[PDB]
Write a protein that binds this ligand. Structure first.
Ligand SMILES: N=C(N)c1ccc(/C=N/O[C@H]2CCCCO2)cc1
Ligand SMILES: [Ca+2]
Length: 223
């Protein structure tokens, strides 16, 4: 997260870190045994880390649970990033409390102008590279589909939305991938892609979660 703020320990209780020896992606806990992330975060040997603030220090509220299976969206295209969504099942159910909690799925799509909270442990610099240890947060508005398409001609599908600031300076970044965009207590987006980070006229692009609720529910129901 570039141009954001320190969230505060366990203030984003649905935020997970995906770990394969090191943090490599975010995710969102949607019930005691399932996490939603980006398909471009797919790899084998994922351990899900819940209740994290400083990802480099055991602070007392962590739950580390290995994934039993991952399901990449049936229509994910890694070239265009269309359908950039993946479900991860935990080997055992997380113990849910105030600091480790699920986030609700949307019942309808959010509109341009809706203010959302974007979070993660990704790069904090728009030019260089600096990775934070503690969770970073950014409040950002959903942008109009027209401005999104104008920013990225030929690249925005109906399964994507832009959020952020066309002036630049405030954005998600590398390492935030797969993490949440939460608007009025609903998971509306997943950190997906962008041209660099926090660049002028290049806002963040996010997977449009409301399009996938049917798939998420039915997948969970049978797995
Ligand atoms: N500007 C953004 N909001 C932005 C930019 C980039 C990303 C993530 N990229 O993932 C890279 C790094 C490694 C995995 C695949 O390739 C997210 C948001
Ligand atoms: Ca920790």
């Amino acid at each position: 997260i570039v141009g954001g703020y320190t969230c505060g320990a366990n203030t984003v209780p649905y935020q997970v870190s995906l770990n394969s020896g090191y943090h490599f992606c975010g995710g969102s806990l949607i019930n005691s045994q399932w996490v939603v992330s980006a398909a471009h975060c797919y790899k084998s040997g994922i351990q899900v880390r819940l209740g994290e603030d400083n990802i480099n220090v055991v602070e007392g509220n962590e739950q580390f649970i290995s994934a039993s299976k991952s399901i990449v969206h049936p229509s994910y295209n890694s070239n265009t990033l269309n359908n950039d969504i993946m479900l991860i099942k935990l080997k055992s159910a997380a113990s849910l409390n105030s600091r480790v909690a699920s986030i609700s799925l949307p019942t309808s799509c959010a509109s341009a102008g809706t203010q959302c909270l974007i979070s993660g442990w990704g790069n904090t610099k728009s030019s260089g590279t600096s990775y934070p240890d503690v969770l970073k947060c950014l409040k950002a508005p959903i942008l109009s589909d027209s401005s999104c398409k104008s920013a990225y001609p030929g690249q925005i599908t109906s399964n994507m939305f832009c959020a952020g600031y066309l002036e630049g300076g405030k954005d998600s970044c590398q390492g935030d991938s797969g993490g949440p965009v939460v608007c009025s207590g609903k998971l509306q987006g997943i950190v997906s892609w962008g041209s660099g980070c926090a660049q002028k006229n290049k806002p963040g692009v996010y997977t449009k979660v409301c399009n996938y609720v049917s798939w998420i529910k039915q997948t969970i129901a049978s797995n």
